[PDB]
């Protein structure tokens, strides 16, 4: 956590912006949380900051004999004396879904019930380091995720899966269009070896896009190898990559990368709410993270890294549109942005799409297109990274990007065009870094 904090610039968000996630509530659905009691017996990283602790997988027992869920929550918001999570003043809703058999039987049949329970407890961010290795398929779970986000103010995050490095290995519900799906890059702890020596390396095991219908997943990356975080007092050494002390230890996976981003979302959401006067929609939080993310060096578009590694301080200050307009087929929204040639210009369009059928060969329902015009007339189409940048249109993703490394100082025109919106109208968010 301490090293990941610096990589994703949560350190700047905390030190220069005051953002520790105070006021925000993150829900974590995972194995269990240390002793499983919300009292003084609880691990120092969470004691006193738990909104609710629910036992779903094993009635009357939310403890963590595995260690996975405790480490994960610790990365989101742990507030121990050491190895803090990214949003150490956020409060925790924890839903224990591990069953007696070691599986995830506490999940309800309808995932919407899971998210609703968390919502009623006050959580507005819901993070899930779990999934099924269905090679990019959009399942019932994926559908329910999408349905829920379109209808409710919940930002939902899912791990990409650990089946890399082959392409098309994204887990469900990580295949959901409306979730923030997170892959793992390496932490920088090179004394531990090749799995933690280059922050611009995708971790070998991180699942890789595209999804089954060709979409870019994961959406973003964060350090996920040799992550030092809260160690459940009931978990054995075998659960860890390495020991540290009796209260913290190392783990590695997309399960570790996802909560780092979840805590960053809590920091980001706090910023909008406290400092920017608005409650940002899940689609804006997602757009802001994408626009601020760093190309780890593979270029775009790319299912190994998605849109890149979270860089939180750039996301904080984006120029935005927060679902303030909705569009029907053939309509368009127009904005203008004065750019500065000194630094790159990144514009990202995200929408919380209507949920797909599990039998559709194409999951996108409503298709919006991003069209950018530079001061001198040059036009760019969302996700077209090959020159000429206006001849390849995107009909698959509900994230579209125009990224210009050496922008012209001057006013850029931004169009959001409704190409085909059968379940309309469709709103959207925009985030602009420059």
Residues carrying an active site annotation: 30, 68, 255
Question: Sign of the CA dihedral 231, 233, 236, 242?
Answer: positive
Taking CB under 5 A as the binding criterion, the range among 76-84, 96-104, 235-243, 376-384 that sits at the site for Ca ion is 376-384
Q: Is 275 one of the binding residues for Ca ion (CB under 5 A)?
A: no
As annotated, the binding site includes 186, 194, 197, 201, 367-369, 384, 386, 388, 391-392, 394, 400
Q: What is the largest CA-CA distance in the chain?
A: 65
Out of 103, 391, 409, 423, the only residue in the binding site for Ca ion (CB under 5 A) is 391
Tell me the C-alpha distance between 434 and 422, whole Å: 34
**Long-range contacts from 338-343, C-beta under 8 angstroms, 24+ separation:** 338/410, 338/411, 338/412, 339/375, 339/407, 339/408, 339/409, 339/410, 339/411, 339/412, 339/434, 340/407, 340/409, 340/434, 341/406, 341/407, 341/408, 341/409, 342/409, 343/407, 343/434
Q: Minimum CB separation from Ca ion for residue 194, in Å?
A: 4
Token output for 286? 């997602």
Q: Minimum CB separation from Ca ion for residue 76, in Å?
A: 25
Q: Minimum CB separation from Ca ion for residue 129, in Å?
A: 21
Out of 25, 369, 372, 434, the only residue in the binding site for Ca ion (CB under 5 A) is 369
Taking CB under 5 A as the binding criterion, the range among 57-65, 224-232, 311-319, 392-400 that sits at the site for Ca ion is 392-400
Per-residue burial over 236-269, b if 16 or more Cβ lie within 10 Å, else e, is eeebbbeeeeebbbbbbbbbbbbbbbbbbbbbbb
CB 317 within 8 A of CB 269: no
As annotated, the binding site for Ca(2+) includes 186, 194, 197, 201, 367-369, 384, 386, 388, 391-392, 394, 400
CB 155 within 8 A of CB 76: no
> Judged by CB, which is closer to Ca ion: 337, or 419?
419
Q: Is 392 one of the binding residues for Ca ion (CB under 5 A)?
A: yes
Taking CB under 5 A as the binding criterion, the range among 80-88, 95-103, 255-263, 369-377 that sits at the site for Ca ion is 369-377
> Judged by CB, which is closer to Ca ion: 64, or 146?
146
Q: Which of residues 211-270 bind Ca ion (CB under 5 A)?
A: none
Q: Is 201 one of the binding residues for Ca ion (CB under 5 A)?
A: yes
Tell me the C-alpha distance between 22 and 14, whole Å: 11
Q: Minimum CB separation from Ca ion for residue 367, in Å?
A: 5
Q: Is 194 one of the binding residues for Ca ion (CB under 5 A)?
A: yes
130 vs 6, 28, 434, CA distance in Å? Answer: 25, 11, 35
Out of 197, 295, 313, 415, the only residue in the binding site for Ca ion (CB under 5 A) is 197
Q: Minimum CB separation from Ca ion for residue 397, in Å?
A: 7
Give contact residues for Ca ion (rule: CB under 5 A). 194, 197-198, 201, 367, 369, 384, 386, 391-392, 394
């Amino acid at each position: 956590n301490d090293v990941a904090r610096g990589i994703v610039k949560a350190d700047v968000a905390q030190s220069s912006y005051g953002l520790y996630g105070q006021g925000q509530i993150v829900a974590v659905a995972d194995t269990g949380l240390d002793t499983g009691r919300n009292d003084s017996s609880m691990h120092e990283a969470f004691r006193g900051k738990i909104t609710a602790l629910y036992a779903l997988g094993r009635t009357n027992n939310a403890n963590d004999t595995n260690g996975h869920g405790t480490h994960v929550a610790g990365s989101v918001l742990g507030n121990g004396s050491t190895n803090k999570g990214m949003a150490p003043q956020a409060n925790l809703v924890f839903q224990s879904i591990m069953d007696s058999g070691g599986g995830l039987g506490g999940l309800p049949s309808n995932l919407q019930t899971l998210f609703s329970q968390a919502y009623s407890a006050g959580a507005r961010i819901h993070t899930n380091s779990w999934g099924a290795a269905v090679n990019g398929a959009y399942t019932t779970d994926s559908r329910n995720v999408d349905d829920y986000v379109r209808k409710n103010d919940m930002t939902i995050l899912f791990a990409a899966g650990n089946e890399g490095p082959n392409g098309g290995t994204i887990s469900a519900p990580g295949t959901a269009k409306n979730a923030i799906t997170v892959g793992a890059t390496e932490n920088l702890r090179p004394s531990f070896g090749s799995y933690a020596d280059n922050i611009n390396h995708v971790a070998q095991f991180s699942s890789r896009g595209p999804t089954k219908d060709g979409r870019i997943k994961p959406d973003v990356m964060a350090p996920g190898t040799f992550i030092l975080s809260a160690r459940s007092s009931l978990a054995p050494d075998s659960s860890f990559w390495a020991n540290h002390d009796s209260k913290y230890a190392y783990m590695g996976g997309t399960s570790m990368a996802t909560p780092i981003v979840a805590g960053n979302v809590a920091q980001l959401r706090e910023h909008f709410v406290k400092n920017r006067g608005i409650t940002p929609k899940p689609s804006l939080l997602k757009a802001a993270l994408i626009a601020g993310a760093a190309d780890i060096g593979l270029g775009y578009p790319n299912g190994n890294q998605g849109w890149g590694r979270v860089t939180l301080d750039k996301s904080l200050n984006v120029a935005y549109v927060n679902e303030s307009s909705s569009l029907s087929t053939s309509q368009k929204a127009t904005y203008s942005f004065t750019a500065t040639a000194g630094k790159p210009l990144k514009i990202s369009l995200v929408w919380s799409d209507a949920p797909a059928s599990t039998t559709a060969s194409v999951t996108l329902v409503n298709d919006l297109d991003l069209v950018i015009t530079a001061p001198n007339g040059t036009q760019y189409v969302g996700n077209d990274f090959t020159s000429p940048y206006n001849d390849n249109w995107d009909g698959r993703n509900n994230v579209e990007n125009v990224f210009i490394n050496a922008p012209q100082s001057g006013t850029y025109t931004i169009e959001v065009q409704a190409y085909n919106v059968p379940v309309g109208p469709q709103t959207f968010s925009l985030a602009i870094v420059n």
